[PDB]
């Protein structure tokens, strides 16, 4: 999966995110929650206010696994295996939400990475996000 040129673009862009990975994830959730209120229901006991430490935490948890995924971009399905069962079998997450989150992630990257978000890099991160989603929804169909 993912061309080598793609891989280079992912590895690089994620470098630029760097220590903002947890920060970027949290902003992606806040964007998602506001844009698609349906998603809030997956975090019933959370404080979803702006600077909630609970949403910050889920960002880092997402940003970290993305980073782990970048780190094993050649064995994602085996690399994300546990996260695939958790979201499909125990969480029963609607596949459409992974598209929603991915899109909100791209929007967030675009707004913080103005020089680095070329059309090319945008295409690479999209295919990367699309691949992660596909692994995490694999257990459905």
């Amino acid at each position: 999966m993912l061309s080598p040129a793609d891989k280079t673009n992912v590895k690089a862009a994620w470098g630029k995110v760097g220590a903002h990975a947890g920060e970027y994830g949290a902003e992606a959730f806040e964007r998602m929650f506001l844009s698609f209120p349906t998603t809030k229901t997956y975090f019933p006991h959370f404080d979803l206010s702006h600077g909630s430490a609970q949403v910050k935490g889920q960002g880092k948890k997402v940003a970290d696994a993305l980073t782990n995924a970048v780190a094993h971009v050649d064995d994602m399905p085996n690399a994300l295996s546990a996260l695939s069962d958790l979201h499909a079998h125990k969480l029963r997450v609607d596949p459409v939400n992974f598209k929603l989150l991915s899109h909100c992630l791209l929007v967030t990257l675009a707004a913080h990475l103005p020089a680095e978000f070329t059309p090319a890099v945008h295409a690479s991160l999209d295919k990367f996000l699309a691949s992660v989603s596909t692994v995490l929804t694999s257990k459905y169909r």
């Binding site: 844009s35 698609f36 929007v107 675009a110 707004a111 978000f117 059309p119």
Partner: protein, 146 residues
């Protein structure tokens, strides 16, 4: 599509600082690069083999501008989206045979482009209101497919 008056004016306030000239081609261009099957519809535009080629095409750039103009028309008639886009719906269904699903992908790229362009000014509540506008537009355009 139901925007509050707060949402309508913020959308309007932002679009004023928007230069359709450049942004018009950034959106079309990125649509071609990111969702490659769309290139099929624009085969007379020339080469779209690489991002460079596409982001260099002057027909791409010119057509983009025209599209965002059409879009600006809707923003000025947010209560009559369907009537505003009826002709274009007919055109895309009966002449070009575009699947309405791609209208959704388009709305997402414009939103990434506005984010890229305005940076920190594209706040979460601003994105929320543009997401609605964009779905409204996808729907008006798909209207004459049904």
């Amino acid at each position: 599509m139901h925007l509050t008056p707060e949402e309508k004016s913020a959308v309007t306030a932002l679009w004023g600082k928007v230069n359709v000239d450049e942004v018009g081609g950034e959106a079309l261009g990125r649509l071609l690069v990111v969702y490659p099957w769309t290139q099929r519809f624009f085969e007379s535009f020339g080469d779209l083999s690489t991002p460079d080629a596409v982001m260099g095409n002057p027909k791409v750039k010119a057509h983009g501008k025209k599209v965002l103009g059409a879009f600006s028309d809707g923003l000025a008639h947010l209560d009559n989206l369907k009537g505003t886009f009826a002709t274009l719906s007919e055109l895309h269904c009966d002449k070009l045979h575009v699947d309405p699903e791609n209208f959704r992908l388009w709305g997402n790229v414009l939103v990434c482009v506005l984010a890229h362009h305005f940076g920190k000014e594209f706040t979460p509540p601003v994105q929320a209101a543009y997401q609605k506008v964009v779905a409204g537009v996808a729907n008006a355009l798909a209207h004459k497919y049904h």
